[PDB]
Design a protein around this ligand. Structure first.
Ligand SMILES: Nc1ncnc2c1ncn2[C@@H]1O[C@H](COP(=O)(O)OP(=O)(O)NP(=O)(O)O)[C@@H](O)[C@H]1O
Ligand SMILES: [Mg+2]
Ligand SMILES: [Zn+2]
Lengths: 311, 568, 153
DNA sequence: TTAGAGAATTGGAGAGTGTGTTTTTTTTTTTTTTT
DNA sequence: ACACACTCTCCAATTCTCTAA
């Protein structure tokens, strides 16, 4: 009863969405865009299939690129420390057998992360021979085994969160993300969002960031003061994932206009039909975050604005 | 001995267990009399005794297995159904010995045809996966579903321990992937198949099984686990997985209507917008031509092979998935499994080498360690590829955009290139269709009917039956009048190709034109090819040939070929 | 209905004073009551274990009942009818004998607890009755029971 | 009340008999031919 | 043929019983 009362109280708030974004990864200074992306991945879209029997992917894949000391691995550390179904893996110290499944049959990392978040750190160090295995699994959300007279097929409904280094260690503003990143085009085509982190030296930011860091070393718990408790936030996220929202009429009209705008900006990775499907996924997750059963067009404006920061 | 029980007397089990009650002579005789009285007497609502009609057909096929539905046995004399569920291994012995009496009542001296008959049970009203089985199920009848993972060869086995034998085979059964819960590995069990049931199923099939659940001692299990642990097996009792005149008349009715070709193409791949030429080519490959051979030095395949060069995200993998669900038999990526079917390739040295041999031949041959053997391919190939990196270059010929040898481009019947072109109106049409399809699919009878009929102009169940009917029944031929014009057009195309300095048109293209014309005739169930079939085939092949060329050559070709690509 | 066999009750305990690590299992505690925690790494399929046995003689019509098993498959020592001396050719009556559900699972130490420069140890655990298939690979669990010693059968 | 002559029951000495034994990965360091 | 497990057989050690001094 008290849990229901507390949940109802925070559900009723006008400013719930902003507080939720602000409560992801309390120790990291700034970078609200990545925190918002992490929340929407954690909530996820709505899985569905057509009359033809073809399935439509209901979940969100994210990749983070940055030059050194940008604290990008802290997001992976938070996610694997928070999300109920999750695994952390390093691109250098792992094998295709250990990632998918192996004969001994025993489960790999992607199997344990079924209906969960799978974290890959220093993705750019992974061998091509193993990147293709992740690509094949990500294409189908399915894993296949056939050897030594034993055959098996397994389900892998797992969302991927990845981190990588730009080639040469520092990003080149003269070049496309494809030029900067050691990743093949089919794999790059399958992340819903890309985030690029840069130092952008500025005294007014440095003076504050240094203070924040020194406070963390000076006081252990006291510095962060998050909007919500972790055990409060997990109950909210569990509650939110019960909603299955529906796309409003006006939102359908609005989506094609925003997609036409993206296509005219495109006329940099070339914008395909997949970006519209991804934008729909993000809008589903946004409506779910707000505990609303209708996709208001404002959510699509939010999704479009968020997506264009990746371009 | 002489006296018999009433059916109401069997309501009380009087011994300490079921098996020790069934096996008593007076009880057993009573059960035998009652089962025979059920089998000679059960009826449809129309009278029309079903089991008298099944025994009749048992001899018509010289068969060995009588099939009994469990619901019928539960609808009257219910206690026998209960005993069957509790003690199958006894009950089926009595039931088999009754079934022989009933069959000999139709066919005296049937014992000379087969010495013993087996009753097969059907429609047992409760189901388990391979999760829910426990020790309480031991020696009970069970009904189970899964995928057959592995199959042994067939062997004879000694029946009695003068000699007699029976056939034997073991099958490994695995949980279907849709049933397995998230984050868990699938479970396995092994099934024993005896005399009539061997080779009833093939590896990779999804199968449903009824049988006894049984166990035995095993020394190795006990030794490795260190506990008195028994091993378990399923002994199968039964295993489970055309058209009327009305369908034929309906097919002929729709084929008699004008524009049926266009409607079939329109029905192709409903969820994908645009790309009509790709749908046309796929339909032509699924219908195919007729194979021919002349022992004087030549042979011609009926299969039609198609290759599609795809920009990233231009619907290629979806149409391959659509074809995989549409087609009767197919392989997706092994060519043995594609025999008389369609083979699907969505991305791409030994693999290419195998395809080189496969396109040259129609049958495959191999030798190893002095062994020699042959296999059949006999299949239509649909392939797709990414054009040498991120984007196709239209200023260049096809070879610059692919990683293929020249004879591949020669031996594919149809080649096509699909590109993500820029147009505000096309983008708006695509986006509106996409969001509309997305809403129409949302998890939140009349609704289905409206949805279906808006989706397609033909119900796809009828279209699949129509494709199967056309493939099995229709075998078109050419008409000898217009072939002079075809020869003149062939010569003209060759002359024009040489005149602009193009790579020349060849006999392979002419053969492909005739084969595609046969396929177009087959699509409307016509046993004759016609002039419009040749015109459409000519347009398809000429346009495909033009698309392969460099830009300056392309302009000269289309300026001259206007009387074929657009006119006729 | 015919006669109904007796229910095999199970006593269970919880809220014990303290939880040990896999690394704290030591032979002085054999046969005591304990509680343990770790991450699951493998599980076996459910198998039937023979709990009580009943046999009948081939050379004469005689029956032996309620034979007790422990760690290895065990059979009678004499023919109970003194008119017969055959010790061989017993068969186990599957109807009259009684079985139990049995499952093997395997666990390893919690990663955050491993001491300096060391690596995680593992252990095998037995589950029976209404607790089989409750455990799942990759999950974190807490167990309670008694530690035992198993021979070289 | 002792003791000695005869009968019955049991133990294990030791002799005999049959028996069993030899005997597709997956991960990681290093050399070699191939593009 | 070489250690073992198991079976068979005969012989004398032992205790029990009856009789008379
Ligand atoms: N009418 C359509 N036209 C184009 N794309 C569509 C259409 N409808 C859906 N899509 C989506 O766009 C993609 C269709 O092309 P498809 O080839 O299946 O994608 P892809 O396999 O990821 N690209 P690729 O890996 O190069 O084959 C899928 O992501 C579809 O969900
Ligand atoms: Mg594709
Ligand atoms: Zn006996």
């Amino acid at each position: 009863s008290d849990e229901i009362n507390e949940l109802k109280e925070m559900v009723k708030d006008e400013h719930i969405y902003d507080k939720l974004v602000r409560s992801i990864a309390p120790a990291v200074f700034g970078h609200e865009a990545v925190k918002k992306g992490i929340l929407l991945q954690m909530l996820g879209g709505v899985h569905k299939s057509t009359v033809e029997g073809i399935k439509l992917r209901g979940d969100i894949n994210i990749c983070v690129v940055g030059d050194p000391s940008t604290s990008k691995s802290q997001f992976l550390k938070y996610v694997v420390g928070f999300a109920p179904r999750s695994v952390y893996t390093s691109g250098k110290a792992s094998s295709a057998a250990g990632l998918t499944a192996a004969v001994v049959i025993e489960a790999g990392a992607l199997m344990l992360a079924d209906n969960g978040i799978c974290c890959i750190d220093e993705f750019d160090k992974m061998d091509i021979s193993d990147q293709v295995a992740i690509h094949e699994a990500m294409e189908q959300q399915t894993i296949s085994i056939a050897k030594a007279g034993i055959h098996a097929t397994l389900n892998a409904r797992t969302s991927i969160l990845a981190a990588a280094n730009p080639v040469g260690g520092r990003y080149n503003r003269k070049l496309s993300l494809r030029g900067n990143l050691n990743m093949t085009a089919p794999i790059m085509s399958r992340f819903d969002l890309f985030f690029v982190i840069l130092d952008d030296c500025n005294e007014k930011i440095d003076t504050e960031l240094a203070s924040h860091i020194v406070d963390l070393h000076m006081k252990r718990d006291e510095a962060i003061e998050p909007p919500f408790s972790a055990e409060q936030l997990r109950r909210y996220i569990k509650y939110a994932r019960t909603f299955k929202p529906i796309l409003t009429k006006e939102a359908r009209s609005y989506l094609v206009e925003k997609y036409k705008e993206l296509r005219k900006d495109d006329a940099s990775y070339r914008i395909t039909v997949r970006q519209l499907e991804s934008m729909i996924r993000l809008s589903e997750a946004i409506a779910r975050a707000n505990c609303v059963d209708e996709i208001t067009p404002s959510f699509i404006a939010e999704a479009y604005d968020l997506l264009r920061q990746s371009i | 001995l002489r006296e018999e029980l009433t059916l109401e007397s069997l309501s009380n089990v009087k011994a300490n267990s079921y098996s020790e009650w069934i096996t008593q002579p007076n009880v057993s005789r009573t059960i035998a009399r009652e089962l025979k009285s059920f089998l000679l007497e059960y009826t449809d609502e129309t009278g029309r005794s079903v089991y008298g009609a099944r025994i009749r057909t048992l001899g018509e096929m010289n068969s060995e297995s009588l099939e009994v539905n469990y619901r019928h046995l539960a609808e009257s004399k219910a206690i026998l159904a209960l005993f069957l569920a509790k003690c199958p291994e006894e009950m089926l012995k009595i039931f088999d010995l009754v079934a022989m009496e009933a069959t000999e009542l139709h066919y005296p001296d049937y014992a000379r045809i087969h010495s013993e008959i087996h009753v097969r049970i059907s429609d047992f009203p409760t189901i388990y996966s391979l999760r829910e089985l426990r020790e309480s199920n031991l020696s009970s009848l069970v009904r189970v579903t899964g995928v057959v993972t592995r199959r042994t060869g067939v062997f004879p086995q000694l029946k009695y321990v003068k000699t007699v034998y029976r056939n034997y085979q073991r099958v490994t059964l695995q949980e279907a992937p849709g049933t397995v819960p998230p984050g868990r590995l699938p479970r396995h069990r092994e099934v024993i198949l005896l005399a009539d049931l061997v080779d009833v199923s093939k590896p990779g099939e999804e199968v449903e099984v009824t049988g006894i659940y049984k166990n035995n001692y095993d020394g190795n299990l006990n030794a490795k686990n260190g506990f008195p642990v028994f091993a378990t097996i399923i002994e199968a009792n039964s295993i489970k997985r055309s058209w009327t005149e009305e369908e034929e008349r309906e097919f002929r009715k729709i084929s008699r209507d004008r524009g049926i070709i266009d409607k079939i193409i329109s029905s192709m791949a409903p969820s994908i917008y645009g790309h009509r030429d790709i749908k046309t080519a796929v339909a032509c490959s699924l219908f195919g031509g007729v194979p021919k051979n002349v022992n004087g030095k030549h042979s011609i395949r009926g299969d039609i092979n198609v290759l599609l060069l795809g920009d990233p995200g231009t619907a290629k993998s979806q149409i391959l998935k659509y074809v995989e669900k549409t087609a009767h038999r197919a392989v997706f990526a092994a060519l043995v499994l594609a025999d008389k079917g369609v083979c699907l390739i969505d991305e791409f040295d030994q693999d290419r080498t195998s395809i080189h041999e496969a396109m040259e031949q129609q049958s495959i041959s191999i030798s190893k360690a002095g062994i020699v053997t042959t296999l059949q391919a006999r299949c239509s190939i649909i392939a797709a590829a990414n054009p040498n990196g991120g984007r196709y270059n239209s200023t260049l010929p096809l070879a610059q955009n692919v990683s293929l040898t020249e004879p591949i481009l020669s031996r594919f019947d149809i080649l096509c290139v699909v590109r993500d072109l820029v147009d505000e109106e096309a983008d708006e049409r695509l986006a509106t269709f996409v969001v509309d399809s997305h809403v129409r699919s949302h998890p939140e009878l009349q609704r289905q009917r409206k949805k279906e009929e808006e989706i397609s102009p033909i119900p796809q169940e009828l279209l699949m039956k129509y494709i199967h009917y056309a493939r099995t029944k229709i075998y078109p031929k050419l008409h000898q009048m217009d072939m002079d014009k075809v020869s003149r057009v062939y010569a003209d195309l060759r002359r024009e190709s040489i005149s602009t300095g193009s790579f020349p048109i060849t006999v392979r293209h002419l053969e492909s034109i005739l084969r595609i014309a046969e396929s177009f005739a087959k699509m409307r169930l016509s046993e004759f090819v016609s002039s419009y079939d040749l015109d459409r085939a000519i347009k398809v092949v000429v346009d495909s040939f033009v698309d392969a060329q460099k830009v300056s050559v392309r302009r000269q070709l289309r300026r001259s070929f206007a009387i074929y690509t657009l006119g006729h | 209905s015919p006669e109904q066999t007796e229910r095999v009750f199970q006593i269970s305990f919880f809220n014990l004073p303290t939880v040990h690590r896999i690394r704290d299992i030591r032979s002085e505690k054999i046969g005591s009551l304990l509680s343990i925690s770790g991450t699951v790494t493998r599980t076996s399929e459910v198998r039937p274990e023979l709990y009580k046995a009943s046999f009948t003689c081939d050379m004469c019509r005689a029956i032996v009942d309620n034979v007790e098993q422990s760690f290895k498959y065990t059979e009678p020592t004499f023919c109970p009818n003194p008119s017969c001396e055959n010790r061989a050719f017993w068969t186990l009556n599957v109807t009259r004998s009684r079985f139990l559900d049995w499952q093997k699972v395997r666990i390893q130490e919690n990663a955050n607890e491993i001491p300096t420069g060391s690596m995680p140890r593992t252990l095998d655990v037995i589950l029976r009755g209404d607790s089989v298939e409750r455990a799942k690979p990759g999950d974190r669990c807490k167990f309670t029971g008694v530690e035992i010693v198993v021979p070289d059968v």
